[PDB]
Amino acid sequence: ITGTSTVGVGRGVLGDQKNINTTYSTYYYLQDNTRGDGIFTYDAKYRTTLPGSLWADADNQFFASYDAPAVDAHYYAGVTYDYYKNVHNRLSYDGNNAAIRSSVHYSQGYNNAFWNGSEMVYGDGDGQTFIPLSGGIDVVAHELTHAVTDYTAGLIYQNESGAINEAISDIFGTLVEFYANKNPDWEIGEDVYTPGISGDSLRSMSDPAKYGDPDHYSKRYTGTQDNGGVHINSGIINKAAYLISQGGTHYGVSVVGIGRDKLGKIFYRALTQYLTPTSNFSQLRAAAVQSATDLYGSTSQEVASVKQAFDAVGVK
Ligand SMILES: N[C@@H](Cc1ccccc1)P(=O)(O)C[C@@H](Cc1ccccc1)C(=O)N[C@@H](Cc1ccccc1)C(=O)O
Ligand SMILES: [Ca+2]
Ligand SMILES: [Ca+2]
Ligand SMILES: [Ca+2]
Ligand SMILES: [Ca+2]
Ligand SMILES: [Zn+2]
């Protein structure tokens, strides 16, 4: 839409108040003109045709219950854009300020979110397994990071390359969560998962096995479900990433942590400079070591920590 930039106010999925960048032209639209070529949020109206209708509101106030997932998708896409730009100097997911589009209210009781090759899509959840998925900043960043990966490494979504693809999305989803300083943790999906159960989450980076995912290469899933276990074997890389950042002793191997900022810098460089569509875990290790080398030198601690971390999860 062509119109005047302005700022609206609303309440997100978790009942928190926030301001959002809108555009005025008869109606107020969920269109943010302050970031690249824009952030656009659409109403899919419980159907599965996409993108649906650009979100329009009569008074620039978004306190209706139906409004909540739109508010959060719009706002958290903005935060995620700011992260990539401010921290990694990347302009949107393609690096050339591509417009970011999201649809909410996809289908009925849909317990998932996804990037469809062109935009982000969020279900409302069934109210037992999930609440509307856009309420989790680690969810939103997970999804936008799939876009970044597609435009960079292009990791195919099956077997080991697909688990790397998934790990990258969980890792940057977590880094954005810390960036926004929004009750940050090394857990995945805790804000929107199982609203009847406190303290849990969909996945854990600090301890994947807590929710049944492998934390060692020896325990990798070798079947064909979940595209050869992309959301399962991701736990092996998530643990590795957690150790590089935070440190720890895992299966007898001790890792000195180097912190989140360096974690992000090393994995961003690996993703954008060295990974390929068919990279496997062993190639990821090579890429990570080379990136750390690039950044910190071959006899640095950072390089040492990267090696220890992959050793700890059994990836040579
Ligand atoms: N590509 C998505 C999966 C998909 C494939 C094909 C078609 C549609 C959707 P994703 O990884 O982005 C989904 C991702 C969303 C998420 C991210 C962070 C935090 C929470 C949720 C994800 O991990 N989804 C789980 C959702 C889920 C868990 C338990 C029950 C039912 C569904 C899965 O698909 O495995
Ligand atoms: Ca309104
Ligand atoms: Ca959190
Ligand atoms: Ca989290
Ligand atoms: Ca829960
Ligand atoms: Zn994913």
Side-chain angles (χ1 to χ4, degrees):
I1 287 245
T2 305
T4 307
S5 297
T6 187
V7 178
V9 61
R11 187 180 286 145
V13 176
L14 299 185
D16 60 316
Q17 182 170 307
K18 61 244 280 183
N19 302 321
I20 39 150
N21 292 119
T22 59
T23 296
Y24 178 72
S25 186
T26 297
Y27 283 100
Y28 299 89
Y29 295 91
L30 291 184
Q31 177 185 316
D32 180 356
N33 304 305
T34 70
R35 292 174 171 101
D37 294 330
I39 298 170
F40 303 83
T41 292
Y42 298 80
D43 185 13
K45 306 161 190 213
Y46 301 139
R47 299 200 67 103
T48 55
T49 54
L50 292 171
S53 289
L54 184 65
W55 198 284
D57 185 87
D59 59 4
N60 211 25
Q61 288 178 82
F62 301 81
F63 292 101
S65 61
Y66 191 85
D67 297 340
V71 171
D72 279 347
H74 191 67
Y75 182 89
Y76 289 143
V79 176
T80 303
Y81 172 98
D82 293 347
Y83 168 82
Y84 276 109
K85 175 178 164 235
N86 290 333
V87 180
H88 299 288
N89 252 76
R90 183 185 189 83
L91 303 185
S92 203
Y93 56 82
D94 72 338
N96 195 199
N97 275 169
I100 300 168
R101 306 181 196 271
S102 310
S103 303
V104 296
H105 294 305
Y106 176 82
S107 204
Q108 291 180 214
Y110 185 74
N111 286 318
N112 226 337
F114 59 90
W115 166 262
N116 75 343
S118 307
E119 60 160 294
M120 300 180 279
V121 190
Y122 300 94
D124 291 326
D126 55 18
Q128 318 152 242
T129 310
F130 282 106
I131 64 178
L133 277 88
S134 62
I137 182 170
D138 56 8
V139 179
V140 174
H142 176 105
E143 293 313 327
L144 192 52
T145 296
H146 276 309
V148 178
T149 291
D150 281 359
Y151 275 87
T152 44
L155 293 159
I156 84 168
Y157 210 58
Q158 41 189 307
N159 304 320
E160 274 186 30
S161 61
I164 296 171
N165 185 320
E166 269 305 300
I168 296 298
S169 276
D170 283 347
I171 290 161
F172 285 101
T174 287
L175 295 177
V176 170
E177 186 170 311
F178 269 99
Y179 176 78
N181 197 26
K182 202 207 132 68
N183 296 298
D185 50 58
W186 293 88
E187 306 285 295
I188 302 295
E190 72 282 351
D191 288 337
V192 294
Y193 188 62
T194 58
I197 309 169
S198 313
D200 64 342
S201 67
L202 181 56
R203 293 182 283 281
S204 177
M205 303 178 65
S206 60
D207 184 14
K210 156 184 233 203
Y211 303 113
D213 303 321
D215 57 359
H216 207 277
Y217 193 67
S218 86
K219 299 193 177 188
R220 79 193 164 285
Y221 177 67
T222 58
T224 63
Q225 297 163 60
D226 187 32
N227 299 110
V230 299
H231 299 91
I232 299 167
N233 287 331
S234 61
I236 296 163
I237 304 316
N238 284 348
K239 181 71 193 196
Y242 169 81
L243 289 172
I244 297 174
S245 185
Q246 300 306 94
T249 300
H250 183 60
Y251 293 102
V253 176
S254 292
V255 190
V256 184
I258 58 177
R260 294 185 328 262
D261 300 314
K262 294 182 181 172
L263 169 73
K265 269 171 237 285
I266 290 155
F267 266 75
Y268 182 82
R269 181 163 184 87
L271 176 68
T272 52
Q273 297 296 310
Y274 291 122
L275 293 176
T276 69
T278 54
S279 288
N280 59 30
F281 281 15
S282 175
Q283 290 168 312
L284 166 69
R285 173 188 176 122
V289 171
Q290 180 63 58
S291 298
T293 297
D294 287 355
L295 299 174
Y296 305 113
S298 59
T299 68
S300 63
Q301 179 69 64
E302 287 83 1
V303 167
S305 278
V306 170
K307 282 170 186 177
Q308 285 289 98
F310 280 99
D311 280 353
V313 298
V315 170
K316 270 49 192 327

